[PDB]
Design a protein around this ligand. Structure first.
Ligand SMILES: Nc1ncnc2c1ncn2[C@@H]1O[C@H](COP(=O)(O)CP(=O)(O)OP(=O)(O)O)[C@@H](O)[C@H]1O
Ligand SMILES: Nc1ncnc2c1ncn2[C@@H]1O[C@H](COP(=O)(O)CP(=O)(O)OP(=O)(O)O)[C@@H](O)[C@H]1O
Ligand SMILES: Nc1ncnc2c1ncn2[C@@H]1O[C@H](COP(=O)(O)CP(=O)(O)OP(=O)(O)O)[C@@H](O)[C@H]1O
Ligand SMILES: Nc1ncnc2c1ncn2[C@@H]1O[C@H](COP(=O)(O)CP(=O)(O)OP(=O)(O)O)[C@@H](O)[C@H]1O
Ligand SMILES: Nc1ncnc2c1ncn2[C@@H]1O[C@H](COP(=O)(O)CP(=O)(O)OP(=O)(O)O)[C@@H](O)[C@H]1O
Ligand SMILES: Nc1ncnc2c1ncn2[C@@H]1O[C@H](COP(=O)(O)CP(=O)(O)OP(=O)(O)O)[C@@H](O)[C@H]1O
Ligand SMILES: [Mg+2]
Ligand SMILES: [Mg+2]
Ligand SMILES: [Mg+2]
Ligand SMILES: [Mg+2]
Ligand SMILES: [Mg+2]
Ligand SMILES: [Mg+2]
Lengths: 304, 304, 304, 304, 304, 304
């Protein structure tokens, strides 16, 4: 909805956003939203995501598709009215994204999703990219395990010429919706095939906000390697504007750079990561700050 | 409608436009249009804005969507007829923009929306953009609060990978419409995802006139950063021709330039702004002229 | 229709076209077509202009839209047949342009619309453009008042982020149609938003011929400023091929060049204009010639 | 239809084609086809041309549109079957072009349309183009009068911002069909607006063959002037491949070059023309050979 | 259908393909397929070719169009099923190409179509192209007569601004279909207008296999001359990949190079041709080897 | 479906993927999936592949198309639900790819398909490409026979101007589906015509995963030769991202490089091949390693 502010309320909002990243217990936001989703009336639509055609499919709290739901409205705080209607398995009325309120007045946050190796990591979408020899696939799985901490991480596989890989976009959005509804740490291996249909465009522009709203993190690999300034600019834009965080390789093999948006209007943080391989390509991230916009663009150049 | 002029009536119009910016009490035009809107018959369509498809949704004076409204025509002064009809939630007949006359013979103005730090600011659309390290989001919020003065400013959030952000264009136009119908100072954070669907194109070409006619100001951030002459040129066209005023970053961190169109055929004014950050990135604009077209083009080069 | 000629009849036509610009009394053609229009049977469709979709809307001699008109044919001189039919507000049969014959055998003219400061001006479409500091809006209004002479000029406002400005193309073409049906001197401020839908394309290729046939002049501002060879070439083509006359700014501030097509197969004339500003930006054109195709292309280069 | 040949029959075909241009009486082919068209059963479809949408309209020998014609087939010599059906004013079955046989076994000719100043001119389409100061409009009218000889020439006007000019493509194809059905010499002033819709593409590719089949000549002006390699290549292709003859200006003012395709597989002829102006821009062509492909391309370069 | 191989059966296939070009009596494959076609049930669909829209029309063994044919399936050797159905003149079910098996296990051949001047020529499609002064039209006709030998060659005319030329794509595919069903040697003058609609794209990708399967040869002229890397690259792709053989002009007037694909996986052969003109441009090809891929690419450069 | 992992289960997965290529018996995965397929209920849809339009066709375990199959759902392990429904020959509900689970938890593998000349080859899609004189058709057939080993290889022929070659995309995908359902080693000659419709796009992004899941290998020829950075980049992307393995020619004639993806997150292997020709162009691959991402991109440059 829209929000109204004066100097006081705005300063309070910023303090609260700062806290959502810097001081809140890691993963607490996810726990809170899990509670909100579970308190929902059975059969109530909680998430709508766009399929390839641009239409949207809707899911309930248990990640089951809602095929028929008769028009139902809800008047919000600002007076606006929210409407949701599902017919023949497709949203007739409503919008893409969370269909129930998880944040409230607390918007524009990058809820700390986890802490690892002395660094806090944000929820939302993390795009892993860059050129060079450092491998991306091993990196997303290592990050997924690290941020997962005590919990297992969920893996969504898409568009690779390997066994068992789904290559259908509509099955892909279904897997992603189920993942965000049920797990805090999510790995997506290969955003490459989405990179374009309407559903693919909706996904790039929606996923970061969906995840951040949920308090979960979606770690997605994205290879720039494609000397086609049409697609490459799309890769840089997705990394610059649709990603909550960015993990990009450097000049040194095994070394990565993490750029994190800490919240609405807040500064971006940066830290380095060292890694090494064990058996069967299993990667390990070794354990034992503020960066300017000009610097951000410098890193974006790496993908050219 | 169309207007007829001779030397005398034209000179009077120009003096009137001049005054609407230079001498009228700040925000007085907004108060005037609030009165016109509130005098409208209940349930009467007052504003129509385009959704993604290119269709238009309609609202009444209370920012409530009109789903059904049988044909109804009104003959204007120039003999032209206006017909409005709404069926199944969409305009069957009518046009985009204000459906009731808010201006009358007083057209081509940039009604002063507020005065701050010794400068007069125009209503209509203000694009906040530029390259470099100066933060845009912090600036739009500080401008909102500064021009809001005694009033709270309205915040419309769109397309950012942060918690609680809507990324659905149709929810976006609904927010914008409600905001212009109810508040004098509006901040839109991220016009980035609009910059393209028919609805997006309608939005860019309509919002400036819509706001200027209401006497409200829409402060929208737009990032150029995207070395793609296709989009970058679209950013310059939007800053050049679709904005009533432009606020753009300088070579010096924290310093901004304000370029204001003061009226139809009138000269553009320019002044500088110094800013500084307080706690949690809350930005403060410190307190304590004419510019030719060539100069304007020089400033536009900055975005390359 | 088609016309047949031999050496004798062709020479007579050329002498008549020459006269229509060089010796006829200024504005007499407009008076003559006003008489043809008023002598039309009530309810008879006289003008059809394309809306955004490419469809056309029809008007009668009083600039009132005709929503229903059953099929009706008329056989011309060359034996051809003209058929007009309007259903549900849209032309079902017919063509865009004047639906009644305003010219007869007298075609290919640039009927003198007015005389000012010692120069004859042609009816039809005049594009006011160029780069540099000389302001276009002030010029089109000054030209409208100068060619208006004893009569008031009509102003069609379109696509500018100022108060009371319509930004809807279908309202715009209704405004234009009504203007040409009722006034000899018309000003269009901002052809920028048309410069693309089918209707926009129809407007650019139709308006010059419609106005010249009527004997009215349409003075339109068109800013080239937009380093995008796709649109800039479109601006040059509209100036070169869809304009009866061209008014373009020069190296010297306040100075303008007028390039006039005097008739079919005739030479283009050129003269200069000096201007100055008074109060509230009211511009005054000071008072007290054949140009080749190469010279013409030279002036077109100015817009790059 | 398809034709079968052996060395003898082929040598005879070539001799006959050579004759159609070099020795037949000028205009005799047109006279013969006029006879064939007049011998046609009343109401029989004789010509189909494509309107803007790509659909085709059909005309009878008197240039009147056939709105309803029930399916009717005719088996040709090679055994193929020709079908023509018209419903609601549009061709349901059939093809674009002449619907009755005018040539027979005599195909691939450039029937001499006229002789003037010691040169034979071909029927089909003649495109008049080039850069520089030599005027095209005066040239097409002078050529039309010259080739017309004892007969008047027909003028089809399209897309110029002058009085009486039709700017509707569908009215344009109607004018052209009527012209080819009734006159040997045809002038088309401004092919510029066709230069793109399906109907416009069909016209460029069909007109030359229609005219040559009829024995009439269509003299069309085409300005290249438009530094847009997309359109300019289209101008060069139309001049190179859809024109039976080409008349292009040279370095010397008033001087033109005529390049004529004399038939299927025959050599292209070339000759120069000197011209001068009299009163009111009436041009006169003064009175008192084989060119290679490489040379042809050299002239095509002139338009860049 | 699909075929299975082991070392033995593969070696036998290759010896068979080798012989189909090198040792079989010239034109014997055409005679063989004529027999297969004539043994087909009356009214049975044998060939389907795509019209402009992308739809396909169907013919029987006598080159007569089938407008109605109820579903009918046929199980092939590999267990695959072929279903053909024609409704309202268009294929409802089936595929483009030969609808009856003309080859069997003998696939991937370039059946020798004729022997002339000591050289063997392949069936399938032959593109005659190149830059320079050597005439293409005269050459395609002389090749047609030379390879026709004792038989007349068939001529399909398309898209030339000359008398009696069809310019309708759907009439074109009808001619081509009839020609391949009834004659061994076919000449298509001007593939220029195809080089783009779905039908045109289908034609370029289908004709070569269609002809090679029939044992007939299609000799088509294609002019590169069009400095537009978009189309020119399309000409090279057509000469490179869609043609069974290529005949291209040299630096020397009258001299041509023939590049022939002799079979699936077999080497390409090359030989030169000297020609001279007789009366009325009738060209005569005078009478009295392996080439690597790099050489081939060198020849393709000629078209730039 | 989605899979969850912790450090332990992830390491087990990687060890299993490693084994699936490095130590499993060659071809065992194919035998295992053949067993899963044959144990399926009769009439059960097992494979869906997209036709040209983007629609999908369905096949049962015997490679016979299913034209009608009423809605039927199956709930997986992650709680997801798979729904298949076929109506009028087309999938109404379901996804493209394998419709039955061939992999289970064992995903992300490149199942060893065969061992030859001391090297293990991966199933999935292998693209054979490169520039230069080394012939591709001879290579794909030699590779098919070598990996076939004791078994015959299946050949799918598509889009070549040779006898018996299908050129219809819908027949092509039916051929491919039948091949993967019945044979371990498949050769596709000429992927050129797919390199674009929705179905072509679906094929490139689906085939690798379909084949790898099955344990079969699809060896396809793809010629880069086409100096059009639009298609060339598409060729590089298909080689880089849609190929399980790549076989590309080098500087030395007859010599080839094999680049193999060994599994999800695993390293790419590389080895060289020497070949020579025998009679009738029958090629023989002579008998008697980790490569970095940078080295990979280097080989991709070869195709420019
Ligand atoms: N033991 C090891 N030592 C060094 N590199 C290893 C390794 N095991 C795996 N890798 C690297 O892991 C990398 C990633 O594997 P891939 O499947 O190619 C995913 P990616 O390359 O990260 O993204 P991509 O598929 O979009 O290009 C490869 O570069 C591989 O070389
Ligand atoms: N205390 C502080 N000192 C200096 N800069 C600060 C700051 N707090 C916030 N900023 C700056 O605020 C800027 C804007 O925050 P963002 O959320 O990135 C919006 P933006 O960058 O202005 O526009 P964008 O999101 O369209 O690119 C960032 O560049 C950040 O560095
Ligand atoms: N008193 C004055 N002295 C000098 N210039 C003046 C002036 N009053 C107005 N102008 C000029 O009037 C010019 C035109 O006003 P604008 O509203 O920008 C229409 P334009 O610039 O002609 O076309 P545009 O809006 O498409 O660019 C401005 O460049 C302004 O500087
Ligand atoms: N008396 C005269 N002396 C020299 N030139 C003359 C002339 N009378 C007319 N002309 C020339 O006639 C030419 C043609 O007039 P236009 O209406 O511009 C048609 P065009 O220029 O030939 O083709 P175009 O409209 O596509 O550019 C102009 O260049 C004009 O200068
Ligand atoms: N007697 C002769 N001597 C030399 N050349 C001759 C000739 N008779 C005809 N020609 C050449 O025959 C050539 C071909 O005639 P055209 O009808 O132009 C077909 P083309 O030029 O080969 O292909 P195109 O029409 O696609 O460009 C011309 O270049 C002409 O010069
Ligand atoms: N005996 C032999 N010695 C050398 N090369 C041979 C040969 N037999 C066949 N070849 C080569 O086999 C190569 C491939 O045959 P083609 O039918 O052209 C398929 P390709 O060239 O591999 O792919 P392409 O058709 O997409 O370009 C040719 O370059 C030919 O020279
Ligand atoms: Mg990867
Ligand atoms: Mg921002
Ligand atoms: Mg202006
Ligand atoms: Mg002209
Ligand atoms: Mg030719
Ligand atoms: Mg090959």
């Amino acid at each position: 909805m829209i929000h109204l502010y004066d100097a006081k309320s705005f300063a309070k909002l910023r303090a609260a956003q700062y806290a959502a990243f810097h001081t809140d217990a890691p993963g607490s936001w996810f726990d809170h939203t899990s509670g909100v989703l579970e308190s929902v009336e059975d059969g109530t639509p909680v998430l709508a995501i766009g399929v390839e055609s641009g239409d949207a499919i809707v899911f309930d709290k248990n990640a089951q598709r809602i095929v028929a739901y008769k028009e139902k409205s809800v008047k919000a705080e600002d007076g606006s009215v929210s409407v949701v209607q599902v017919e023949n398995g497709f949203m007739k009325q409503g919008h893409r994204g969370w269909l129930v309120d998880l944040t409230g007045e607390l918007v524009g946050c990058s809820p700390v999703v986890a802490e690892f190796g002395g660094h806090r990591y944000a929820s939302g979408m993390v795009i892993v990219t860059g050129k060079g020899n450092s491998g991306k696939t091993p990196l997303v799985h290592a990050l997924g395990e690290a941020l997962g901490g005590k919990d297992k991480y969920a893996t969504v596989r898409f568009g690779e010429p390997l066994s068992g890989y789904n290559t259908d976009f509509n099955v892909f959005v279904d897997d992603i919706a189920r993942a965000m509804l049920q797990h805090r740490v999510i790995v997506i291996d290969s955003l490459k095939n989405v990179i374009i249909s309407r559903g693919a465009f909706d996904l790039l522009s929606d996923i970061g906000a969906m995840a951040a709203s949920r308090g979960c993190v979606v770690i997605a690999s994205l290879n720039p390697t494609s000397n086609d300034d049409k697609i490459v600019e799309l890769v840089k834009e997705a990394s610059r504007s649709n990603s909550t965080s960015l993990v990009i390789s450097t000049d040194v093999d095994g070394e990565w750079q993490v750029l994190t948006r800490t919240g609405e209007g807040l500064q971006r943080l940066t830290h380095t990561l060292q890694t090494s391989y064990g058996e069967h390509s299993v990667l390990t991230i070794h354990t034992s700050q503020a960066s300017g916009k000009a610097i951000q663009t410098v890193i974006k150049n790496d993908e050219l």
